[PDB]
Amino acid sequence: ETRVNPRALEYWVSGEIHGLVDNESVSEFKEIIEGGLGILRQESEDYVARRFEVYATFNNIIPILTTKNVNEVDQKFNILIVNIESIIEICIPHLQIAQDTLLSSSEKKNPFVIRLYVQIVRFFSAIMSNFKIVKWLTKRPDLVNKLKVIYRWTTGALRNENSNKIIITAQVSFLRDEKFGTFFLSNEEIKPIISTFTEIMEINSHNLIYEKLLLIRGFLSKYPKLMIETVTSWLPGEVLPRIIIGDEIYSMKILITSIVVLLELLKKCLDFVDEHERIYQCIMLSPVCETIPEKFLSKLPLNSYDSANLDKVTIGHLLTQQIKNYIVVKNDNKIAMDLWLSMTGLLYDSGKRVYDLTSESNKVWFDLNNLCFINNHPKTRLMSIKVWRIITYCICTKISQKNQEGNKSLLSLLRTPFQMTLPYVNDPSAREGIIYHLLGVVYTAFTSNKNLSTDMFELFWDHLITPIYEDYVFKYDSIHLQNVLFTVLHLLIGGKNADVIHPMSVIASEGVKLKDISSLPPQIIKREYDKIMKVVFQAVEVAISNVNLAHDLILTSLKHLPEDRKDQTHLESFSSLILKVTQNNKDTPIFRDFFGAVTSSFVYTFLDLFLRKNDSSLVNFNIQISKVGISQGNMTLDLLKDVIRKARNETSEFLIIEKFLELDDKKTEVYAQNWVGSTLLPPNISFREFQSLANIVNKVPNENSIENFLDLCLKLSFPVNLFTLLHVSMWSNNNFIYFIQSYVSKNENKLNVDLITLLKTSLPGNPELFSGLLPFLRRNKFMDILEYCIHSNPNLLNSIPDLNSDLLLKLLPRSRASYFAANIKLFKCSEQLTLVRWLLKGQQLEQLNQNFSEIENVLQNASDSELEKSEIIRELLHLAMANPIEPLFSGLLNFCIKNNMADHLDEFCGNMTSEVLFKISPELLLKLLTYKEKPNGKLLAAVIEKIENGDDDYILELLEKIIIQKEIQILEKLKEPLLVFFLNPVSSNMQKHKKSTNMLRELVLLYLTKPLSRSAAKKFFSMLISILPPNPNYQTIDMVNLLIDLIKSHNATLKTIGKWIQESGVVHQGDS
């Protein structure tokens, strides 16, 4: 049973035994092959009776390529390679014979010979259609030169004589699957094969039409260049009219397949275009009867006129009518727009023919599209607006730019889908179609079109994008649609959040997605920035409710602002834009955050325009933003912080804070003081930043900021004069004080020029500041300042809170004590006591004179210390003896007014001078020596020393005073004034005689007001006359006569006194 021989005819029985029942993946295949050939090589009847069996066996034992079987098939195909020459020399003549015996005789087609022909053809196709053999043949030009002939014999066998249905089927399956021709056939050897397609045998078998259509569909994908070069023959022949005749005659699969041929043909024509316009000249230009053969013209449905006039009707006419029939009659929309699409692409993918879309007779196409779009099915609308992708491709990629008006009309036609979907905007499908078509337009016009430039980008943006957005996008209501389209805009200008090349891909079922858009590119942005922003801004103004899009659009818009365009205009434009964003919104925490980021990035973008001292644009802007915000102060502060963070290592924060202090917001001031007064101040600071910081401390000085600032000044690397930047004379008194203390203690511990100049002008005019710095300066000496202050403004001494008398004695006034003498009224007790000591010890006697009333007013009301008054008064009396003048003597009068002065008064009564005695006035001397005892009565010495041998009228004045005052106690002593009265004639005259007369009479008148003295009367009476020698002069006798007569008005001793009286009278008798 075993050992079935592989060769020698014992294997091949009649019509059976093919294998391989179980000889898989083994060289048994090889044996079956070689033995087979070893049978085909003989010519005996026994071996020729097994041809059909050998070729059926071959066609059976060849495996099919599976994804799990490739090494086995390759080994078997190598097995076929080894025997290639035997297969040539043997099998080619078998094909020749098997063909001639079938085509030579027009009738009597033999069945078995047909079997053999089919089997042989299938073997040869199996050896030509696949395998590495085509590669192996590049090493053997002879074998390919021998193989080429099969194409010739098939070429003749397709047009010659009764080729049976199965014969033609095998031939077209071979010519459909054959692959050797890829490498070894020239154009001139292929074109005849293509010419055969048009003219073959009669058919009407719905299997051969489909097989031929598959043949065409493979030939397009195999030799595209030649299939386009020869389209004029094969397309109007066995492909195109199949659609015009319709589904009545041919099954649906026929029509659909031929339409697919149109699609593939498009896929190929989009790579070469062809400059001969063969498709257009063939379909739209030439008549019907010119390009459709009679075979199909005799089966062509037509009306009366278009049938009687086959010269004015075109292929495109019938095709358009038939598409309309598929929409209206069949409702097979998909078929209709598949056609329509392939038609439009094949006809108008040439730049010359694109413009023909604007012609009137070519807008019937678009009307047809409308006929397909008004259907109720959502997917039908969506598809009818999706197929415009071909229009997008043709217009965008095949425009010439030259005819600007033609371009603008073509773009207006490209905006048609939006016109269609406008009234359907409430339907999701229409919206998805809008997004689809727009993305196709942007992709095919910008992202993929690598030839956009100055002359082009304007035509695209100003006549396609801008019209789309101004006419349609900004007017759609659903904020999700606006969200998507505006998102497209955001993705164009960089700043992408798209989650992530050839224009071709626009013509796809899924189309373009958002992830295939960015960028624009930048080099176009810098040029046409204004053009772009003229649309972006509108988008922002219409999408104020969609805060995210406004935030991202404004931010990534500023991020792409060129440096060469950072001027005032753009700044103000962004200002108006943001202001519109806030005006049409309400303050929510979210909008607070976003708006904060927008303002911060806006100020940071134009930073070098807000940081100039005289612009004030930052102030205006702050006023604008304060409208829509709760905590506006914290919006200013948060703005400062954010702008600082944006330029962390780009612009020093000091320069920002300086110009943010022109806003006078208290919270930014607090932040500035807290920042300067605690941050680390680097010694490596540049002068620009240092002067900025100095302006900060100058604007808002604080204790900590002064400390830290000066600690920086100690470590600088450049000279600097602080007072050209600080202007410390303007600060509050406290900050001034602390600046002085810190600057002194730290910088020098000593006063320099600038400090002197500052103090000599800021202190004399401020009593509070003076009282504040007084302890510090007092401790640090620096008397050249304090003495200057008192010299230029004495009233500072009144404003000293705790004015120590030691400090006052050391702070002599001192050059203009006249003011102090005049204004001593406005001072304190002990301070006056110690003050007058400067006038005394300074010999400022005149100042004590002209302002004596205030001095007596001071000493009047007592004081803290009375010993002070004691010494002061002692020196004052020394001055009273030195120079009488007048004031100090009124002061002596006031001393007499006070009783406690008794000690100093007696002192004065014991210290007299022969010059002062008559500068003394009587009106006070009387009241002085009357109401006092002997202590004051010791002044009487000089008094007597002037009574005798002195001045007449002063003595007479004293006597008149004591007379009119009636001071009886003093009159006891009269001997000396009586000696005067006796020796006072000299010149006499009635004036002095009457004077002495009256003065004597009245002086003796009140000598005793009550006669109760008893023996004293005797005592005095014995002495007052014991010193009376009236002998000299006669006018004395009158005086003595008055005396005696007055005595005669008043016991036993009075008689003796009378006798002595008569004695003096006798002495008078001796003078008469």
Q: Nearest-5° angle of CA 609, CA 610, CA 615?
A: 90
Q: Which of 140, 164, 188 is the last residue of a domain?
A: 164
Q: Which of 970, 971, 998 is nearest to 984 (CA)?
A: 998
Closest CA to 670 of 630, 693, 699: 699
Distances (CA, A) of 468 to 172, 440, 461, 734: 51, 13, 10, 68
Positive/negative CA dihedral, 371, 374, 379, 383: positive
CA dist list (Å): 176 to 124, 161, 168, 169, 377: 13, 22, 12, 10, 39
With 0-12 / 13-18 / 19 or more C-beta atoms within 10 angstroms meaning exposed / middle / buried, residue 325 is middle
DSSP string, 647-678: TTTTS-HHHHHHHHGGG--HHHHHHHHHHHTT
The three-state (H, E, C) secondary structure of 1033-1050, written as one string: CCHHHHHHHHHHHHHCCC
Q: How far apart are CA 93 and CA 889, in angstroms?
A: 174
DSSP one-letter code for 1:
-
190, 192, 194, 195: CA torsion to nearest 10: 170
Structure-block tokens of residue 90: 């043997």
Instruction: Return the amino acid letter for 831.
Output: E
Angle at 777 between CA 772 and CA 783, to 5 degrees: 130
In the chain, the N- to C-terminal Cα span, in Å, equals 230
Domain boundary among 164, 194, 221: 164
Phi, psi (rounded to 5 degrees) for 314: -115, 165
| Residue whose entry in the numeric block shows the structure tokens 């930043």 | 689
Query: Does residue 125 form part of some domain?
Result: yes
Residue 811 Rama label (left phi>0; alpha psi -120 to 50; beta): beta
Residue 608 CA: distances (Å) to CA of 338, 556, 568, 571, 601: 60, 19, 11, 11, 13
Query: Nearest-CA neighbor of 717 among 695, 744, 689?
Result: 689
* Residue 1021 belongs to some domain of the structure: yes
267-271 contacts, C-beta under 8 A, 24 or more apart? 268/220, 268/221, 268/224, 268/227, 268/228, 269/228, 269/345, 269/346, 269/349, 270/345, 270/349, 270/393, 270/504, 270/507, 271/224
Q: Is the peptide bond before 519 cis (omega within 30 degrees of 0)?
A: yes
How many other CB atoms are found less than 10 A from the CB of residue 844? 16
- Decide if 119 is inside a domain: yes
Report yes or no on 880 lying in a domain: no
CA distance 418 to 391: 14
Q: Are 975 and 1023 in contact (CB under 8 A)?
A: yes
Residue 656's closest CA among 627, 698, 710, 696?
A: 696
Calculate the dihedral angle through the C-alpha atoms of 627, 630, 634, 640, rounding to the nearest 10 degrees.
-40
Is 31 a domain residue?
Answer: yes
Radius of gyration of the chain (CA): 70
In sequence order, which ranges of 500-586 are alpha helices (DSSP H)?
522-542, 547-559, 568-583
Nearest to 675 by CA among 724, 637, 726, 631: 637
What separation in angstroms does the CA of 904 have from each of 850, 910, 936, 1053? 24, 10, 10, 46
Smallest CA-to-CA distance from 449 within 502, 491, 385 is with 502
Structure tokens belonging to residue 215: 């043949």
The whole-angstrom separation of Cα 190 and Cα 178 is: 12
Q: Domain range spanning residue 1050?
A: 982-1069
CB proximity list for 510: less than 8 A, separation 6 or greater: none
Dist. CA 340–CA 554, nearest whole Å? 43
What lies within 8 Å, CB to CB, of 577 at 6+ separation is 537, 540, 541, 554
DSSP-derived 3-state class of residue 409: helix
Establish if 77 belongs to a structural domain: yes
Q: Which candidate, 856, 840, 775, 842, places its Cα nearest to that of 814?
A: 842
User: What's the CA gap between 632 and 614, in Å, rounded?
Assistant: 23
Domain-located, residue 1030:
yes
Rounded Cα distance between 644 and 912, Å, is 90
The Cα–Cα gap between 872 and 836 comes to 8
- CA-CA distance, 100 to 102, in Å (whole number)? 5
Q: Of all residues in the chain, what percent are helix, strand and coil, respectively (each to 5)?
A: 70, 0, 30
Answer yes or no: is 472 within a domain: no
Residue from 170, 171, 275, 177 nearest 219 by CA? 177
DSSP H/E element including 263? helix 252-269
3-state secondary structure of 881: helix
Domain edge (last residue) among 164, 193, 228: 164
Burial 123-155 (b: 16+ CB within 10 A, else e): bbbbbbbbbebbeebeeeeebeeebeebbebbb
Q: What 8-state DSSP symbol labels residue 1018?
A: H
Domain count, the chain: 2
Q: Are 891 and 856 in contact (CB under 8 A)?
A: yes
User: Angle 764-767-772 (CA atoms, 0-180°, nearest 5)?
Assistant: 105
- Token pair in block for residue 102: 């079938």
